[PDB]
Each structure stands twice: as structure tokens, then as C-alpha cells.
Ligand binder design. Structure first.
Ligand code: ZN
Length: 199
């Protein structure tokens, strides 16, 4: 009956967890991850590589879904969506509905859900085994609004929840991370890490 998605980490039977590239904090960087904050900083609409790690290969038809929720208690029940400006920008990639914050880049089998009961948005792809040479698979996400967008996120922090699901949509595994979509991810990461250190 509930409609706030769980954010509880759950490796489950296949040992599912995320990984992120070591991109550093140069002012040219477009996506960078802070382990200390469990937080991804990225530029608007730029590629965000997220690694999917498992201890064992899940069955054919396993899928991976991404969904954003507001991190603060008082905002958790509100659907995370694009702002009144971006949803009207005609920046369709062919597949993503205009209201969806999170897109997957470069995957023909990406499916976008507007949940009929909760009204939440998500994007889901087939979970593919690592290519020869790789130990993991990578999904490329894009975030299509700034954290600061007025009438959208409006400076409120979000989490992305990544779920590993069977072909029916049943939970196999879960992980999550905070996201800030910003003009200078490198600088903003250095700043927030400094603040944490000082605290
Ligand atoms: Zn926006």
C-alpha cells in the first residue's frame, strides 16, 4: 500500500552493489563521485557512468532500475520530476518522456515507467553480463535538470535508488547514492568534502 520507495541497501543473493570511477575534482570534470559523502556530482545532461557489481551472474531477464527520491523527510513523498522549464525544452532523446529527470544514454532497450499508482518515474534496462576484459557492467545515466532548478528540485537534495529486479519486477538487490547536478562538480565536491572534514 506504501508509495515512498525503500532506500535500504540490500546486496541480496547475487552480491549486488554499485561502483564509481575515480574521476578527480579538476574544474574540467563532468561527473565525479565522493565516497565520504556517498554523493555523485555531475553536470547537466552529461554522461554519468555507474558500475554494477555482482558476486554471481543473475538470471537472463534480470533488469536494473533507477529512480530518484528527495533525501529530506519532509520532501520524500513528493515525486522528483523535471522543472517547468526543462520539461518543456524539446530535448527528447527519442525515448525518455520529457518529465523524467533520469535518462539512460545509449541503450535501445531502456524503458521508462510512470507508475500508475505512485506516479513516480524510473528508467529500467536489461542487466547485461560484463564484456570480455571487464569485471563489471557500466550504465550511463544522464540527469536532465540542475539541483537548483526552480519549480523542480529547487536546491533540495535527491537520492538515486538503483534496484536489481527479476523479470517480474521483484527486488533482488538495492543500492543508492546522493546526487548534485551542478555547473562545477569538481569544485562543489571539494567544497562539500571540506565542510565534512571541518565538521
Ligand atoms: Zn530544470
Amino acid at each position: 500500500s506504501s508509495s515512498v520507495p525503500s532506500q535500504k541497501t540490500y546486496q541480496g543473493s547475487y552480491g549486488f552493489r554499485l561502483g564509481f570511477l575515480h574521476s578527480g575534482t579538476a574544474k574540467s570534470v563532468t561527473c565525479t563521485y565522493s565516497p565520504a559523502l556517498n554523493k555523485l556530482f555531475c553536470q547537466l545532461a552529461k554522461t554519468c557512468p555507474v558500475q554494477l557489481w555482482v558476486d554471481s551472474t543473475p538470471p537472463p531477464g534480470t533488469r536494473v532500475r533507477a529512480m530518484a527520491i528527495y533525501k529530506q523527510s519532509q520532501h520524500m513523498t513528493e515525486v522528483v520530476r523535471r522543472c517547468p522549464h526543462h520539461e518543456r525544452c524539446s530535448d527528447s532523446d527519442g525515448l525518455a518522456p520529457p518529465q523524467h529527470l533520469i535518462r539512460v544514454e545509449g541503450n535501445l532497450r531502456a524503458e521508462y515507467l510512470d507508475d500508475r499508482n505512485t506516479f513516480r518515474h524510473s528508467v529500467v534496462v536489461p542487466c547485461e553480463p560484463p564484456e570480455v576484459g571487464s569485471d563489471c557492467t557500466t550504465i550511463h545515466y544522464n540527469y536532465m535538470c540542475y539541483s537548483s532548478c526552480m519549480g523542480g528540485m529547487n536546491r533540495r537534495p535527491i537520492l538515486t535508488i538503483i534496484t536489481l529486479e527479476d523479470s517480474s519486477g521483484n527486488l533482488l538487490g538495492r543500492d543508492s547514492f546522493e546526487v548534485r547536478v551542478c555547473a562545477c562538480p569538481g569544485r562543489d565536491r571539494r567544497t562539500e568534502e571540506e565542510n565534512l572534514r571541518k565538521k
